[PDB]
Design a protein around this ligand. Structure first.
Ligand SMILES: CC(C)CCC[C@@H](C)[C@H]1CC[C@H]2[C@@H]3CC=C4C[C@@H](OC(=O)CCC(=O)O)CC[C@]4(C)[C@H]3CC[C@]12C
Ligand SMILES: CC(C)CCC[C@@H](C)[C@H]1CC[C@H]2[C@@H]3CC=C4C[C@@H](OC(=O)CCC(=O)O)CC[C@]4(C)[C@H]3CC[C@]12C
Ligand SMILES: CC(C)CCC[C@@H](C)[C@H]1CC[C@H]2[C@@H]3CC=C4C[C@@H](OC(=O)CCC(=O)O)CC[C@]4(C)[C@H]3CC[C@]12C
Ligand SMILES: Cc1cc(NC(=O)[C@H](c2ccccc2)N2CCCc3ccccc32)no1
Lengths: 157, 129, 36
């Protein structure tokens, strides 16, 4: 039974569905902490989101350390070659900046709330990378990818 | 009463299906049948579009509801706001510049991306049927 | 006397703002469909 449990939970599809259930929960808790009040000290629902961001930061550090090339700057550049890793790191430093500003008193709490409110936009946009695997949503995600360049060239005219 | 109002509401939601049921007959018309099958394929296409439309749209809506009105108490009216207000936000409007970036991205990705993606999707499904 | 330069501006605005650029945009996003 333990071998069956260990074989189930180490499967990649089981890991993917567990991870997207944890996102859905993360999006739920982030919606709660941007709609409900926010005081001098965070609630349980905000400490959970802070722990979410900190454990991903630790996971991205483990992605930095545990990769194929041996040089530190080389593996950092290899990990930063993907655009989604760049935007994930940008969101991690954005959330830590917003949390540090939020931990201070007013009017920095409003700035931290604004940084949270601009981070939830990226944490909803990040789901397009998962949608990229759906046989019917993946073409639409790549269509958004081409239409971004097309609208960027249209925007000048 | 008040069960008569519930029966009237059930009649009023049944008349919708009893008008929609005519599409099965229209399915035999040499010119209406292709349109009925086009509705049939476009239902699945719009169902798959609706997830991306929600991910794009209600995220901003949550962004607007958390930037503006910062003192909304915990209630179920918040969800009604975040999927009714941006549905009718056509007529709506030192460092107070983060909000116009939100409206700017809203105008960029809300209609001008997703709607044109929808005419593109429903144009590609024409010749295949 | 000569207050007619402004309706030419609104007229060209209606001509080139939506009725040109928006239809150019559905044309652009329609051509990019089959290529992907
Ligand atoms: C991938 C998994 C982790 C997603 C599922 C998330 C849940 C495990 C979390 C999300 C919301 C959490 C709840 C948010 C708020 C509270 C209230 C908290 O109680 C108080 O703050 C005071 C007592 C009270 O009035 O309940 C006790 C924990 C609890 C139930 C939390 C328990 C854990 C919950 C259900
Ligand atoms: C398995 C996947 C799909 C994730 C499922 C997540 C839910 C189990 C979580 C996410 C949001 C959570 C809610 C977020 C906030 C609240 C308010 C909280 O109430 C308070 O904080 C007020 C004080 C009190 O506890 O009485 C009670 C728990 C509740 C409903 C949580 C119940 C558990 C929820 C629905
Ligand atoms: C991303 C898509 C697919 C779903 C988005 C879901 C949100 C719009 C929902 C999920 C969790 C909901 C919250 C869950 C719990 C509550 C507590 C609820 O208050 C009570 O139940 C009063 C009693 C108490 O808990 O103290 C008011 C609504 C609210 C804030 C909900 C508001 C709407 C939320 C954020
Ligand atoms: C905070 C926070 C973010 C997050 N989710 C992800 O950012 C992402 C993910 C997104 C959707 C579904 C499943 C996973 N994810 C989580 C773990 C690290 C990682 C590595 C590579 C690719 C994705 C990924 N969960 O909490």
């Amino acid at each position: 039974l333990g071998r069956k449990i260990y074989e189930f939970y180490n499967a990649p599809i089981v890991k993917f569905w567990f991870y997207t259930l944890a996102y859905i929960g993360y999006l739920m808790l982030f919606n709660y902490i941007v709609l409900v009040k926010m005081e001098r000290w965070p609630s349980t629902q905000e400490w959970i989101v802070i722990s979410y961001i900190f454990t991903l930061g630790i996971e991205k550090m483990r992605e930095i350390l545990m990769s194929e090339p041996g040089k530190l700057l080389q593996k950092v550049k290899v990990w930063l070659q993907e655009y989604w890793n760049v935007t994930d790191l940008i969101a991690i430093l954005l959330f830590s900046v917003g949390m540090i500003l939020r931990l201070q008193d007013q009017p920095f709490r409003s700035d931290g709330r604004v940084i949270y409110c601009v981070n939830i936009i990226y944490w909803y946009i990040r789901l397009l990378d998962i949608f990229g695997v759906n046989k019917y949503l993946g073409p639409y995600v790549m269509m958004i990818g081409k239409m971004m360049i097309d609208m960027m060239y249209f925007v000048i005219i | 009463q008040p069960f008569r109002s519930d029966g009237r509401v059930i009649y009023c939601v049944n008349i919708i299906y009893w008008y929609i049921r005519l599409l099965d007959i229209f399915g035999v018309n040499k010119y209406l049948g292709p349109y009925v099958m086009m509705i049939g394929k476009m239902m699945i296409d719009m169902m798959y579009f609706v997830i991306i439309m929600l991910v794009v749209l209600m995220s901003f809506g949550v962004a607007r509801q958390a930037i503006l009105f910062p003192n909304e108490e915990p209630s179920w009216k918040l969800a009604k706001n975040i999927f009714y207000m941006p549905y009718w936000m056509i007529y709506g409007e030192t460092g107070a510049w983060i909000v116009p970036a939100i409206m700017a991205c809203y105008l960029l990705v809300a209609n001008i991306l997703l709607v044109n993606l929808l005419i593109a999707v429903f144009n590609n499904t024409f010749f295949e049927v």
